[PDB]
């Protein structure tokens, strides 16, 4: 029975509005409704992994797991295995997988982050799960960010706190946050970003939605505009939105958006908005394709509609050779030529690099770089030809070309990372000098870039 090269992953996000679900929710898991929907001919084909994010979830874990499992069993005739479930207040994540995957899944981690302080600490935050699927690391974040049209900067702050403090994945990757720890990271939830148009335009917006004309609304979507301005979700992707706003509906129908200010809303307007979102970030040159992104039309217990997204994701096998794991494979090496880091910092410490990769027995520390003053005031840290030669555990090109090197640039004075990035070994050639590049981020904000050349030697 061969190991898979690709799996499909279902991501769902639903703010349940503190109400129990209706008796049938299969349309969610089938990617049926509005937007980019799944072909009917696939209805009986199970996804490999289902990741369900809820917000304002009133059910117990037991209650929701029985609904989810019975739903999937009705669709597929498969009894899914529970990988992980984690709940913070009313924010929940469930991961289910086909039983055949049980002995492919390991290193399961869960964590949560509570956002805010005093007044704003006690219901918003995030839950997440990570695990290894054979040779591939997967991370999943369900966040419920701050509500309200005039709180986009709070949402951006909530995002930064979640990616700084959520402790998932390999703890040896100590300079790296969740935006660098996983081959594939999916971040979804009630992100709560709104369509920023004047309150007076509510009925105009409703009109546009009835005509399925979303362009003039999406051009004012706060998540799209903040992403464009590099204020949040830097280096994440989102599929084009082709479904109506998923909030705020009158319950028990989808015929009416309830936008007007009421005592129950704190006298705030809730103009129709795409609160409910799925984004992803995968390592460079790894296969990831969004197959569906949409909302259901027939699940009406909440003031939000459920959102679905599905992906075809590249995975790799748990490689064994005669040599690695547990020794090096002299026949492999990774070399770096003409490398330099450019950093936005005003600081003047010396810097060194750390190279982290599961193709190495342990991380590798470089010598200090040579600081130069760049022509437009920036800091250039030159490594030239001084970087160590990295010694992978396995030299087989079928393994090595699928790997990645994480890079941290650290201060010699504090050993704090000033920037993190990632280089793919999926090169156009071996034994050949080729350009490499990554942006560098810290706390998920841009701090610089690293570029140079690489030369990869495999056993072939
Ligand atoms: C509008 C916007 C927001 N955030 C990032 C970008 N980058 C360009 C891009 C990103 C994905 N795929 C193709 C092109 C663009």
């Amino acid at each position: 029975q061969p190991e898979p090269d690709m799996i499909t992953i279902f991501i769902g996000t639903w703010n349940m509005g503190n109400a129990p679900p209706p008796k049938k929710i299969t349309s969610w898991f089938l990617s049926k409704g509005q937007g980019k929907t799944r072909d009917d001919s696939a209805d009986y084909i199970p996804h490999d992994i289902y990741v369900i994010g809820t917000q304002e979830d009133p059910l117990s874990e037991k209650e929701w797991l029985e609904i989810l499992k019975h739903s999937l069993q009705e669709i597929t005739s498969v009894t899914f295995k529970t990988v992980a479930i984690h709940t913070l207040w009313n924010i929940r994540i469930v991961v289910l997988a086909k039983p055949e995957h049980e002995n492919r899944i390991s290193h399961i981690c869960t964590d949560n982050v509570k956002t805010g302080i005093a007044n704003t600490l006690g219901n918003k935050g995030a839950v997440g799960v990570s695990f290894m699927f054979n040779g591939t690391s997967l991370g999943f974040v369900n966040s419920h960010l701050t509500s309200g049209s005039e709180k986009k900067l709070r949402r951006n702050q909530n995002y930064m706190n979640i990616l700084r403090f959520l402790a998932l994945g390999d703890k040896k990757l100590s300079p790296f946050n969740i935006t660098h720890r996983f081959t594939h990271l999916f971040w979804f939830g009630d992100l709560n970003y709104r369509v920023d148009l004047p309150t007076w335009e509510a009925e105009t917006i409703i009109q546009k939605i009835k005509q399925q004309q979303y362009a003039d609304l999406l051009s004012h979507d706060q998540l799209l505009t903040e992403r464009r301005e590099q204020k949040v979700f830097l280096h994440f992707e989102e599929e084009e939105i082709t479904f109506a706003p998923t909030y705020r509906f009158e319950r028990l129908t989808r015929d009416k958006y309830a936008y007007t200010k009421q005592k129950a809303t704190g006298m705030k307007y809730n103009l129709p908005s795409w609160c409910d979102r799925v984004l992803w970030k995968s390592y460079p040159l790894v296969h990831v394709v969004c197959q569906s992104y949409g909302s259901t039309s027939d699940i009406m217990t909440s003031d939000h509609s459920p959102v679905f997204a599905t992906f075809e994701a590249g995975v790799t096998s748990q490689f064994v050779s005669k040599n690695g794991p547990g020794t090096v494979d002299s026949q492999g090496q990774i070399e770096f030529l003409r490398c330099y880091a450019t950093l936005k910092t005003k600081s003047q410490t010396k810097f060194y690099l750390e190279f982290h990769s599961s193709c190495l027995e342990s991380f590798v520390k470089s010598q200090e770089g040579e600081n130069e003053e760049g022509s437009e005031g920036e800091l250039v840290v030159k490594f030239g030809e001084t970087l160590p030669k990295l010694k992978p555990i396995i030299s087989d090109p079928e393994y090595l070309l699928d790997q990645h090197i994480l890079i941290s640039i650290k201060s010699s004075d504090s050993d704090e990372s000033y920037g993190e990035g990632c280089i793919a070994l999926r090169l156009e050639a071996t034994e050949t000098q080729l350009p490499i590049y990554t942006p560098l981020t810290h706390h998920g904000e841009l701090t610089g870039h690293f570029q140079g050349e690489i030369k990869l030697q495999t056993s072939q």
Side-chain angles (χ1 to χ4, degrees), residues 2-460:
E3 296 304 320
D5 293 309
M6 294 184 358
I7 59 171
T8 75
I9 302 172
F10 175 94
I11 304 297
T13 181
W14 186 28
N15 179 320
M16 297 175 74
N18 302 110
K23 55 176 178 281
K24 177 174 210 55
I25 60 169
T26 53
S27 290
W28 192 18
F29 306 120
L30 288 173
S31 295
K32 305 293 177 188
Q34 282 179 60
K36 289 172 178 299
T37 65
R38 183 164 185 247
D39 199 81
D40 296 333
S41 69
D43 287 358
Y44 306 145
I45 300 173
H47 294 295
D48 295 289
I49 302 178
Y50 289 79
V51 183
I52 304 86
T54 53
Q55 315 84 32
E56 305 186 35
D57 181 339
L59 302 177
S60 69
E61 289 186 351
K62 175 183 177 169
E63 286 167 337
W64 187 221
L65 194 58
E66 178 191 321
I67 288 160
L68 293 174
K69 289 199 175 200
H70 286 156
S71 288
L72 293 184
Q73 161 75 214
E74 181 158 285
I75 292 161
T76 67
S77 299
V78 172
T79 301
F80 275 73
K81 296 286 186 186
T82 306
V83 176
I85 180 161
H86 187 70
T87 307
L88 167 64
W89 297 320
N90 300 93
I91 308 167
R92 178 174 292 151
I93 186 166
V94 181
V95 178
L96 303 176
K98 298 184 63 187
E100 69 196 72
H101 294 330
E102 185 184 348
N103 302 286
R104 294 177 171 127
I105 292 172
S106 71
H107 300 81
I108 300 162
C109 305
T110 61
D111 196 23
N112 62 264
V113 169
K114 302 170 173 184
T115 55
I117 48 190
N119 258 215
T120 69
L121 193 154
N123 75 279
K124 297 309 192 294
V127 294
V129 176
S130 63
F131 52 94
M132 289 299 298
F133 184 95
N134 287 337
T136 301
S137 60
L138 301 175
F140 302 93
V141 178
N142 172 24
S143 63
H144 192 183
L145 308 183
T146 293
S147 64
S149 67
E150 316 301 299
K151 297 195 171 169
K152 81 189 182 191
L153 298 183
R154 287 297 180 249
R155 289 183 273 283
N156 297 350
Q157 290 168 338
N158 295 158
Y159 165 83
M160 174 181 299
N161 285 318
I162 292 159
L163 74 87
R164 280 186 69 176
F165 296 123
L166 196 64
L168 296 173
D170 180 4
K171 302 322 186 262
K172 289 178 184 197
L173 296 179
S174 60
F176 301 98
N177 66 55
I178 54 164
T179 74
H180 285 120
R181 284 186 176 190
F182 306 107
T183 317
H184 303 281
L185 171 64
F186 295 93
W187 189 321
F188 45 97
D190 183 353
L191 309 189
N192 251 320
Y193 291 91
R194 308 306 181 90
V195 168
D196 222 334
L197 280 170
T199 309
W200 55 265
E201 295 275 53
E203 288 299 327
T204 305
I205 295 163
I206 289 166
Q207 295 208 318
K208 294 292 195 197
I209 298 167
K210 293 176 169 170
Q211 292 168 94
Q212 306 176 59
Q213 285 173 23
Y214 306 134
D216 304 340
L217 307 182
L218 289 165
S219 72
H220 298 274
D221 173 86
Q222 292 168 338
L223 182 50
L224 295 178
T225 62
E226 292 295 275
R227 280 178 64 215
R228 185 176 313 109
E229 291 180 37
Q230 295 180 35
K231 304 303 183 73
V232 78
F233 278 101
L234 184 61
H235 304 139
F236 280 73
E237 306 299 333
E238 188 189 22
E239 177 73 22
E240 184 186 358
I241 294 169
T242 65
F243 50 99
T246 56
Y247 180 73
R248 178 174 184 253
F249 288 104
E250 188 184 304
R251 298 182 191 228
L252 305 186
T253 184
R254 297 290 82 158
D255 290 353
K256 184 183 290 138
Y257 285 100
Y259 67 82
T260 203
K261 63 183 191 179
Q262 301 289 179
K263 282 188 270 177
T265 68
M267 305 302 296
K268 290 174 218 300
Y269 287 95
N270 290 293
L271 294 183
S273 293
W274 286 284
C275 291
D276 308 297
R277 308 290 272 268
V278 178
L279 297 94
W280 75 94
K281 182 182 181 185
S282 300
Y283 284 170
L285 299 181
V286 179
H287 181 84
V288 54
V289 178
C290 179
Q291 296 188 332
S292 71
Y293 188 35
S295 62
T296 61
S297 313
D298 57 345
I299 299 171
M300 297 170 298
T301 51
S302 180
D303 51 5
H304 296 247
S305 284
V307 163
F308 47 81
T310 61
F311 300 87
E312 175 187 83
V315 293
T316 61
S317 298
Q318 297 185 48
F319 219 94
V320 177
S321 75
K322 301 201 181 174
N323 301 305
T327 189
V328 298
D329 199 334
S330 78
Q331 302 161 79
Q333 56 176 49
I334 314 169
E335 298 177 287
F336 296 91
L337 293 84
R338 301 172 61 178
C339 285
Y340 62 92
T342 303
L343 295 184
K344 297 181 191 290
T345 192
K346 294 170 202 183
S347 135
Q348 256 297 1
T349 182
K350 297 187 193 176
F351 291 92
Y352 62 94
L353 302 181
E354 295 185 355
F355 300 89
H356 291 68
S357 183
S358 51
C359 77
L360 304 178
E361 283 209 301
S362 68
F363 76 85
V364 176
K365 277 149 134 53
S366 81
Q367 289 206 311
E368 295 174 326
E370 296 213 331
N371 294 351
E372 304 163 12
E373 161 91 354
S375 91
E376 274 170 292
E378 340 97 295
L379 182 66
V380 175
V381 184
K382 182 174 165 180
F383 293 100
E385 314 295 310
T386 61
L387 296 171
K389 188 190 300 182
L390 305 177
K391 294 309 182 88
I393 60 165
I394 291 163
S395 62
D396 184 335
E398 296 245 53
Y399 166 83
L400 197 50
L401 289 161
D402 281 348
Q403 304 307 308
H404 294 81
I405 310 300
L406 292 174
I407 296 179
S408 170
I409 180 158
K410 287 168 140 198
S411 159
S412 294
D413 295 345
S414 67
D415 296 306
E416 68 196 300
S417 187
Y418 278 57
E420 301 100 58
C422 181
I423 301 298
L425 299 188
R426 188 77 71 74
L427 308 193
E428 290 292 345
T430 61
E431 294 178 317
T432 300
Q433 290 167 26
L434 293 163
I436 58 168
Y437 173 71
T438 182
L440 296 172
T441 65
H442 189 67
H443 300 165
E445 302 188 309
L446 196 66
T447 60
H449 71 264
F450 179 85
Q451 65 176 67
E453 300 178 298
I454 202 167
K455 179 136 62 149
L456 178 67
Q457 192 168 144
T458 69
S459 60
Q460 285 299 103

